[PDB]
Design an enzyme around this catalytic site. Structure first.
Site, short mmCIF file in Angstrom:
data_model
loop_
_atom_site.label_atom_id
_atom_site.label_comp_id
_atom_site.label_asym_id
_atom_site.label_seq_id
_atom_site.Cartn_x
_atom_site.Cartn_y
_atom_site.Cartn_z
CD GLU A 235 -6.78 14.76 -21.32
OE1 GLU A 235 -6.71 14.45 -22.55
OE2 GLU A 235 -5.84 14.55 -20.51
CD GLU B 41 -6.53 12.12 -30.85
OE1 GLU B 41 -7.15 11.15 -30.35
OE2 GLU B 41 -5.35 12.02 -31.27
#
Length: 204
Positions: free
Chosen positions: A66, A75
């Site tokens: 991730e 992100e």
């Protein structure tokens, strides 16, 4: 007891692969991880030594995937604010609930629920997940233990592939073989470093 299985040395091994220019470097710390691990009963403390090692390897394999190997806090180029209108967990105007932290916590409903458990205002201060190391790791342990089937899967014989299923359903059954391979690759590497057999049901 997680500190007994996961040493400072082991953690620095994982964390130190990151480019020095990565935001995660110096942010993802052993201290924050141990603090987070000790806040959730049963996390990496359930079952025999091999069970505990496999849970922790599964946790870290997913974290490594991730965050691009503990490189990213935020992100990359999020396409949206991750706001689903809700009467329970209202979005704050001008805030973004894009992925932050070791398991890339996303969406207003998740930030709200995480905040209530951990002790910060998830809807009004989602940026805390990218700014406080302990809070950041706590969101990932919270998600693993309370907001997903991850812990249950890896402690009921569903194996590492069970945790992938619990995190991102769409990757399994050939949905994205490359994403699965990425996760599985980390898991196998980490198991070998912890001296534990990876077990059954490794992929999905």
């Amino acid at each position: 007891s997680v500190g007994g299985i996961i040493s400072q040395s082991f953690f620095n091994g994982l964390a130190g692969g990151a480019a020095s220019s990565c935001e995660g470097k110096g942010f993802y710390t052993y201290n924050a991880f141990i603090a987070a691990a000790n806040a959730y009963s049963g996390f990496g403390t359930t079952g025999s030594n091999d069970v505990k090692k496999r849970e922790l390897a599964a946790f870290f394999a997913n974290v490594m995937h991730e965050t691009g190997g503990l490189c990213y806090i935020n992100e990359k180029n999020p396409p949206i604010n991750y706001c689903q209108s809700s009467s329970t967990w209202p979005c704050t105007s001008g805030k973004s609930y894009h992925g932050r932290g070791p398991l890339q916590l996303s969406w207003n409903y998740n930030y709200g629920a995480a905040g209530k458990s951990i002790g910060f205002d998830g809807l009004n201060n989602p940026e805390k997940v990218g700014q406080d190391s302990t809070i950041s790791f706590k969101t990932a342990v919270w998600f693993w233990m309370k907001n997903s089937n991850c812990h249950s899967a890896i402690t009921s014989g569903q194996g590492f592939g069970g945790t992938i299923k619990a995190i991102n359903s769409m990757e399994c059954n050939g949905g994205n073989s490359g994403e699965v391979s990425s996760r599985v690759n980390y898991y196998k590497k980490i198991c070998s470093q912890l001296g534990v057999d990876p077990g059954a049901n490794v992929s999905c």
